[PDB]
Structure 1
Amino acid sequence: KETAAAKFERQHMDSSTSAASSSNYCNQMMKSRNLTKDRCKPVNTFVHESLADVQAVCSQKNVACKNGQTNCYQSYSTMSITDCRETGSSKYPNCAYKTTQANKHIIVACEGNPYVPVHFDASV
């Protein structure tokens, strides 16, 4: 069974590309990472940094999570990310997304032993 840490990697990690991300990127990635099976997942971010660098965020700036929990961490440096947002005309099963590349500080929730990212909270 898929661990929370593994689910985070599936939903949020894409170390393979530096940034770029073609206009097609989100359409392809949301589908291939299995985020379009149950529904069109409305909002999802992929991080283009090493797994070690993203895992390292769990020891960085402690900040409040959007849900009020205390286990979120903001990266000290900006990271290459791609936001995927479902378009207004997108209709399941044909999920359609706008692809937006940015360099921003990520905020992730961390849990477990080892203490690793399990949720992508925000970018700032």
Structure 2
Amino acid sequence: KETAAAKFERQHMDSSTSAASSSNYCNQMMKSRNLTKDRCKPVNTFVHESLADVQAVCSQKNVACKNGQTNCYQSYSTMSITDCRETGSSKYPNCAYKTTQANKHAIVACEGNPYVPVHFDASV
């Protein structure tokens, strides 16, 4: 299958650009990370920082996750993040996304040994 840590990398990491391309950034990334294979993933966030900086969030501020679990952590600093969300024109197999880029704190759930990100909970 895919491990939880590897799925978090594929779905949420983009260390190759400092910030969302243009308005088409999300259409391109949602497709290349295979998030539009059988259906259009409705919402997905990409973090534009090194993998090491995102992994380090797991030893930063411990905060509750939205679902009540207590293994979430909020980055001490803001990070460049792009939220990708389907627009009304989106309809599989022609997915379409709005791209919203901003500098926000990343909140991730962590698990395992090594203790690394396994879910993206929110940005603030």
**TM bin (shorter chain):** over 0.9
Q: Residue 109 of structure 2 contacts residue 118 of structure 2 at CA under 8 Å; is this kept in 1?
A: yes
Q: Give the number of aligned pairs.
A: 124
Cα shift readout 1:80-107 (whole Å, capped 9, x = no counterpart): 0101010012110100000111000010
Tell me how far apart the structure 2 counterparts of residues 27 and 108 of structure 1 sit (CA, whole Å).
Answer: 23
Between 30-39 and 47-56, report the one with greater CA deviation.
Answer: 30-39
Q: Residue 110 of structure 2 contacts residue 116 of structure 2 at CA under 8 Å; is this kept in 1?
A: yes
Between 32-41 and 6-15, report the one with greater CA deviation.
Answer: 32-41
Q: Tell me the CA shift for residue 38 of structure 1.
A: 2.3
Q: Residue 11 of structure 1 contacts residue 33 of structure 1 at CA under 8 Å; is this kept in 2?
A: yes
Q: Residue 45 of structure 1 contacts residue 84 of structure 1 at CA under 8 Å; is this kept in 2?
A: yes
Q: Secondary structure at the match of 1:8?
A: helix
Q: Residue 21 of structure 1 contacts residue 82 of structure 1 at CA under 8 Å; is this kept in 2?
A: no
Between 16-25 and 65-74, report the one with greater CA deviation.
Answer: 16-25
Q: Tell me the CA shift for residue 79 of structure 1.
A: 0.1
Cα shift readout 1:57-98 (whole Å, capped 9, x = no counterpart): 000000000111000000000000101010012110100000
Uncovered stretches (5+) of structure 2, i.e. residues with no partner: none
Moved over 4 A (4+): none
* TM-score where L is the length of structure 1: 0.98
Uncovered stretches (5+) of structure 1, i.e. residues with no partner: none
